[PDB]
Enzyme design. Sequence first.
Site, PDB file in Angstrom:
ATOM      1  N   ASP A  44       0.837  -1.202   0.000  1.00 43.37           N
ATOM      2  CA  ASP A  44       0.000   0.000   0.000  1.00 43.37           C
ATOM      3  C   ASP A  44       0.870   1.249   0.000  1.00 43.37           C
ATOM      4  OD1 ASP A  44      -2.805   1.195   0.352  1.00 43.37           O
ATOM      5  OD2 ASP A  44      -1.620   2.242   1.880  1.00 43.37           O
ATOM      6  N   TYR A  49       2.939  10.070   0.670  1.00 44.09           N
ATOM      7  CA  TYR A  49       3.853   9.473   1.651  1.00 44.09           C
ATOM      8  C   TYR A  49       5.311   9.835   1.362  1.00 44.09           C
ATOM      9  CZ  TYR A  49      -0.258   6.586   2.838  1.00 44.09           C
ATOM     10  OH  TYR A  49      -1.520   6.145   3.164  1.00 44.09           O
ATOM     11  N   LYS A  78      -2.532   6.047  -4.452  1.00 43.65           N
ATOM     12  CA  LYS A  78      -3.653   6.934  -4.158  1.00 43.65           C
ATOM     13  C   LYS A  78      -3.404   8.317  -4.739  1.00 43.65           C
ATOM     14  CE  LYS A  78      -3.871   4.545   0.344  1.00 43.65           C
ATOM     15  NZ  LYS A  78      -2.402   4.500   0.658  1.00 43.65           N
ATOM     16  N   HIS A 111      -7.689   9.327  -2.511  1.00 48.92           N
ATOM     17  CA  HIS A 111      -7.126   9.178  -1.167  1.00 48.92           C
ATOM     18  C   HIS A 111      -8.088   9.678  -0.083  1.00 48.92           C
ATOM     19  CE1 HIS A 111      -2.959   9.016   0.995  1.00 48.92           C
ATOM     20  NE2 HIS A 111      -3.930   8.685   1.827  1.00 48.92           N
TER      21      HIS A 111
END
Length: 316
Positions: A44, A49, A78, A111
């Site tokens: 994931d 990030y 995402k 997201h």
Amino acid sequence: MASRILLNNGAKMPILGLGTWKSPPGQVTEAVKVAIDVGYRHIDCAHVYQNENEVGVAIQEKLREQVVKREELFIVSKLWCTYHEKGLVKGACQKTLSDLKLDYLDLYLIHWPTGFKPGKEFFPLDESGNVVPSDTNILDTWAAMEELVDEGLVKAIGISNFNHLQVEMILNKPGLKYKPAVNQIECHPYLTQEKLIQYCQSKGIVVTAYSPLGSPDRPWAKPEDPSLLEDPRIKAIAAKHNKTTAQVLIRFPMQRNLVVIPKSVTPERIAENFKVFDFELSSQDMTTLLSYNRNWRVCALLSCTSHKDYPFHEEF
Ligand SMILES: NC(=O)c1ccc[n+]([C@@H]2O[C@H](COP(=O)([O-])OP(=O)(O)OC[C@H]3O[C@@H](n4cnc5c(N)ncnc54)[C@H](OP(=O)(O)O)[C@@H]3O)[C@@H](O)[C@H]2O)c1
Ligand SMILES: O=C(O)Cn1c2ccccc2c2n[nH]c(=S)nc21
Ligand SMILES: O=C(O)Cn1c2ccccc2c2n[nH]c(=S)nc21
């Protein structure tokens, strides 16, 4: 317990994956290498990030080493909030593909339902500190996601942090071409999500449980906060099965027909977290774990409570 769950696009998704939020860029490459070496097939990811390049290095090495074939991997990313504008969606996906060094994603998620003003900043602010929203309708964002399927960039599309009314809006979209395959939401014994999970499952949407260990490394954690990993009641259930508390916390959503994505950068824990296919929680164990619900949300997006599409005002 089968290792994969069938999605409404015809593909199978591994029910256990490795989370990567907060995984430092200098540690995540080895984390993903270790995960693949010990059997993980689902990672994931997300652009926000800030570590997709480093995740991609690991995936690429394991493909090159022939530890795993691309078709055996299930890579999820995402679309960040600043890319909800219809004309920005493809470029955002392409940047993620480029960083991950892939030619398709298995699953691409919106997201959050909240769109923000485009630009370099992930959380664009007005001078008074409020997030600056986008005027782009989520239905238009969904249409842009559908185009990614049709252009071969992604095999499946889905959503994350959508409440049931927001899911319903997608399902009722005029001219809907592809249903969401997945809704990825926070879920653990302190936020059990029975209503939203039942709704999604009844529509054939697979639910992925995020922060299954309560995200103890979330940056806004307070010392006095509840701790799943330290809950003596959960510890007792673990002891009964000769498993760790983390292993119980991971097995729990699996037995609810959920996908689960625990994060670790610690090689011993990455391995521990995968060893969850050799025991079964009883129905009694399951109901007991469900009983611990406190509606305690570790990811409440408090920064965006004023946003018109903030998902957590609704009961579910
Ligand atoms: N869609 C969204 O909005 C959203 C939001 C939140 C999370 N997510 C996804 O869900 C993933 C998981 O959630 P999360 O990262 O918030 O938290 P989490 O998986 O609930 O917990 C991660 C924390 O638990 C520790 N840990 C892992 N395994 C352990 C074990 N066996 N024993 C003891 N401690 C252990 C990790 O430490 P170490 O890493 O130091 O080993 C880390 O501090 C995220 O990484 C991300 O991929 C998505
Ligand atoms: O969106 C995510 O997947 C995790 N996450 C983040 C990931 C990267 C940067 C900021 C955030 C963030 N901010 N608030 C909340 S509730 N959750 C956040
Ligand atoms: O607001 C966000 O997007 C994330 N976040 C935070 C972001 C910055 C500072 C504090 C927090 C915070 N506190 N509690 C919760 S549930 N979420 C928090």
